[PDB]
Design an enzyme around this catalytic site. Structure first.
Site, PDB file in Angstrom:
ATOM      1  N   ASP A  54       0.787  -1.227   0.000  1.00 10.19           N
ATOM      2  CA  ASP A  54       0.000   0.000   0.000  1.00 10.19           C
ATOM      3  C   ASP A  54       0.818   1.275   0.000  1.00 10.19           C
ATOM      4  O   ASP A  54       1.327   1.697   1.044  1.00 10.19           O
ATOM      5  CB  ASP A  54      -0.952  -0.006   1.210  1.00 10.19           C
ATOM      6  N   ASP A  67      -1.644   5.631  -5.255  1.00  4.82           N
ATOM      7  CA  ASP A  67      -2.047   4.777  -4.143  1.00  4.82           C
ATOM      8  C   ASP A  67      -2.395   3.344  -4.542  1.00  4.82           C
ATOM      9  O   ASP A  67      -3.514   3.089  -4.976  1.00  4.82           O
ATOM     10  CB  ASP A  67      -3.253   5.487  -3.502  1.00  4.82           C
TER      11      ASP A  67
HETATM   12  C1  LIG Z   1      -7.070  -4.006  -1.022  1.00  6.43           C
HETATM   13  C2  LIG Z   1      -8.059  -3.456  -2.064  1.00  6.43           C
HETATM   14  N1  LIG Z   1      -8.559  -2.164  -1.610  1.00  6.43           N
HETATM   15  C3  LIG Z   1      -9.865  -1.727  -1.642  1.00  6.43           C
HETATM   16  O1  LIG Z   1     -10.776  -2.494  -1.966  1.00  6.43           O
HETATM   17  C4  LIG Z   1     -10.088  -0.310  -1.274  1.00  6.43           C
HETATM   18  C5  LIG Z   1      -9.275   0.308  -0.262  1.00  6.43           C
HETATM   19  C6  LIG Z   1      -9.352   1.704  -0.008  1.00  6.43           C
HETATM   20  C7  LIG Z   1      -8.500   2.329   1.002  1.00  6.43           C
HETATM   21  O2  LIG Z   1      -8.973   3.042   1.890  1.00  6.43           O
HETATM   22  N2  LIG Z   1      -7.160   2.075   0.900  1.00  6.43           N
HETATM   23  C8  LIG Z   1      -6.246   2.331   2.041  1.00  6.43           C
HETATM   24  C9  LIG Z   1      -5.587   1.003   2.423  1.00  6.43           C
HETATM   25  C10 LIG Z   1      -6.532  -0.174   2.714  1.00  6.43           C
HETATM   26  C11 LIG Z   1      -7.802  -0.049   3.458  1.00  6.43           C
HETATM   27  C12 LIG Z   1      -8.595  -1.240   3.669  1.00  6.43           C
HETATM   28  C13 LIG Z   1      -8.123  -2.511   3.135  1.00  6.43           C
HETATM   29  C14 LIG Z   1      -6.858  -2.656   2.427  1.00  6.43           C
HETATM   30  C15 LIG Z   1      -6.068  -1.455   2.201  1.00  6.43           C
HETATM   31  C16 LIG Z   1      -5.164   3.371   1.632  1.00  6.43           C
HETATM   32  O3  LIG Z   1      -4.254   3.553   2.592  1.00  6.43           O
HETATM   33  C17 LIG Z   1      -5.853   4.735   1.288  1.00  6.43           C
HETATM   34  N3  LIG Z   1      -4.865   5.742   0.885  1.00  6.43           N
HETATM   35  C18 LIG Z   1      -5.579   6.986   1.173  1.00  6.43           C
HETATM   36  C19 LIG Z   1      -4.552   8.090   1.388  1.00  6.43           C
HETATM   37  C20 LIG Z   1      -6.544   7.363   0.022  1.00  6.43           C
HETATM   38  N4  LIG Z   1      -6.346   6.673   2.395  1.00  6.43           N
HETATM   39  C21 LIG Z   1      -6.806   7.719   3.309  1.00  6.43           C
HETATM   40  C22 LIG Z   1      -6.493   5.353   2.529  1.00  6.43           C
HETATM   41  O4  LIG Z   1      -7.057   4.837   3.490  1.00  6.43           O
HETATM   42  C23 LIG Z   1     -10.309   2.516  -0.723  1.00  6.43           C
HETATM   43  C24 LIG Z   1     -11.205   1.941  -1.694  1.00  6.43           C
HETATM   44  N5  LIG Z   1     -12.139   2.783  -2.328  1.00  6.43           N
HETATM   45  C25 LIG Z   1     -12.977   3.717  -1.507  1.00  6.43           C
HETATM   46  S1  LIG Z   1     -12.578   2.609  -3.916  1.00  6.43           S
HETATM   47  C26 LIG Z   1     -13.948   1.480  -4.104  1.00  6.43           C
HETATM   48  O5  LIG Z   1     -11.483   1.957  -4.575  1.00  6.43           O
HETATM   49  O6  LIG Z   1     -12.950   3.896  -4.439  1.00  6.43           O
HETATM   50  C27 LIG Z   1     -11.067   0.517  -1.956  1.00  6.43           C
HETATM   51  C28 LIG Z   1      -7.410  -3.430  -3.398  1.00  6.43           C
HETATM   52  C29 LIG Z   1      -8.031  -4.318  -4.367  1.00  6.43           C
HETATM   53  C30 LIG Z   1      -7.439  -4.392  -5.681  1.00  6.43           C
HETATM   54  C31 LIG Z   1      -6.258  -3.599  -5.912  1.00  6.43           C
HETATM   55  F1  LIG Z   1      -5.677  -3.707  -7.115  1.00  6.43           F
HETATM   56  C32 LIG Z   1      -5.627  -2.693  -4.969  1.00  6.43           C
HETATM   57  C33 LIG Z   1      -6.236  -2.587  -3.677  1.00  6.43           C
END
Ligand SMILES: C[C@@H](NC(=O)c1cc(C(=O)N[C@@H](Cc2ccccc2)[C@H](O)[C@@H]2NC(C)(C)N(C)C2=O)cc(N(C)S(C)(=O)=O)c1)c1ccc(F)cc1
Length: 379
Positions: free
Chosen positions: A38, A222
């Protein structure tokens, strides 16, 4: 064209497009876990207690080298959150650099909508900078520890191959992972991997929005976010243009909002009716930019088949955000992305594994002339 980094090639895996993970071994004796890569966060954390979606987890009592920091840690994400306990332990990446470091580790003891059923990963590797780490910037992120304790160059690169595999080359670049040239955009500030988008086109057609709108608040790279997320005003204008460009077929409004998905008979998806999307990024020379272009195969993502059926269902993976532009997996899967922390820049090149057809391919082209790019950033 050669490859001294061969052992790191193909070190990433994915289960039904639910996150790209790499194996990391922590503690002693060895405890290997699947860790989500991530670039959108800065905490290294691993499940450390049983959970319905976890196959395995970190057992601190079994690690003689585990050192308790006596401090709690909470990390909220866009999607989900978790609570845990901080400590340090020995960490190595079997298919990564040939080194071992003592890094901070958050043992996840409770969580809400964080872990994903069937994803096969049990932790997360926050690759961004210290400024956004929790509890605060004094908790050194894993990569910072790697660079400080070893000779590994301050740089890593990601090749996310969508439909699930990929490569995370640590300490360098492998030329077999891309074609064409690498184009770099500056890292504006070292917190998230912030960049600046100066122009947006849908099928060669300028969206014609003031570039400040594209980066309102910020624009980041990201790998932890699935979609290409855009600020409200940008999202609306983009969907309007995309719909106009693919008018040879109409879809319900919910499709563009990601609420409804559309399925096609296996192997008949009319990729050709959907437009390509180009994002122009600030270049490394004054008034110079370049553009990266993705195909519908990148922004239209497959939805875990019902059970090996004859239907290819897709979800429109471009959505809205209120915290700036998020160039997630839909963007990254079309390219080999170089996170050159040493030179404060991010490189993009056409990925040797990106999904495409016999008529179109993702591209990274330049240079272009773009004036007043500095003003596009938000202050
Ligand atoms: C693994 C999975 N992640 C998700 O399914 C996901 C995670 C976050 C997320 O918050 N990512 C954060 C890390 C995270 C959270 C929960 C589970 C796993 C990983 C990340 O840190 C994110 N960066 C920012 C700075 C945006 N932020 C505040 C975050 O929380 C946001 C979304 N969305 C809202 S969306 C539908 O894509 O518009 C979806 C994924 C699936 C296929 C891939 F190919 C790459 C990643």
């Amino acid at each position: 064209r050669r490859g001294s980094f061969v052992e790191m090639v193909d070190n990433l895996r994915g289960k039904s497009g639910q996150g790209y993970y790499v194996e990391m071994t922590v503690g002693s004796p060895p405890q290997t876990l699947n860790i989500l890569v991530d670039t959108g966060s800065s905490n290294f954390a691993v499940g450390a207690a049983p959970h319905p979606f976890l196959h395995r987890y970190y057992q601190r009592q079994l690690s003689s080298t585990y050192r308790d920091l006596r401090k709690g840690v909470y990390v909220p994400y866009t999607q989900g959150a978790w609570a845990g306990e901080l400590g340090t332990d020995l960490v190595s990446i079997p298919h990564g650099p040939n080194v071992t470091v003592r890094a901070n580790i958050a043992a996840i003891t409770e969580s809400d909508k964080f872990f994903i059923n069937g994803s096969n990963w049990e932790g997360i590797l926050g690759l961004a900078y210290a400024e956004i780490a929790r509890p605060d910037d004094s908790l050194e992120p894993f990569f910072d520890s790697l660079v400080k304790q070893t000779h590994v160059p301050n740089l890593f690169s990601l090749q996310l191959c969508g439909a699930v595999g990929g490569s995370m080359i640590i300490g360098g670049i492998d030329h077999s992972l891309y074609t064409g040239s690498l184009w770099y955009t500056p890292i504006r500030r070292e917190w998230y991997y912030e960049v600046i988008i100066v122009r947006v086109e849908i099928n060669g057609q300028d969206l014609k929005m003031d570039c400040k709108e594209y980066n309102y608040d910020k624009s980041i790279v990201d790998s932890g976010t699935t979609n290409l997320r855009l600020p409200k005003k940008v999202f609306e204008a983009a969907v309007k243009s995309i719909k106009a460009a693919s008018s040879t077929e109409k879809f319900p409004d919910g499709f563009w909002l990601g609420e409804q998905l559309v399925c096609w008979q296996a192997g008949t998806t009319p990729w050709n009716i959907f437009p390509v999307i180009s994002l122009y990024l600030m270049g490394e020379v004054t008034n110079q930019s370049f553009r990266i272009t993705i195909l519908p195969q990148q922004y239209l993502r497959p939805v875990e088949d019902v059970a090996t059926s004859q239907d290819d269902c897709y979800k429109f993976a471009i959505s809205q955000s209120s915290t700036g532009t998020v160039m997630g997996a839909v963007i990254m899967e079309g390219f080999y992305v170089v996170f050159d922390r040493a030179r404060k820049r991010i490189g993009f090149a056409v990925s040797a594994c990106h999904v495409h057809d016999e008529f179109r391919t993702a591209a990274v082209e330049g240079p272009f002339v773009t004036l007043d790019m500095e003003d596009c950033g938000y202050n």
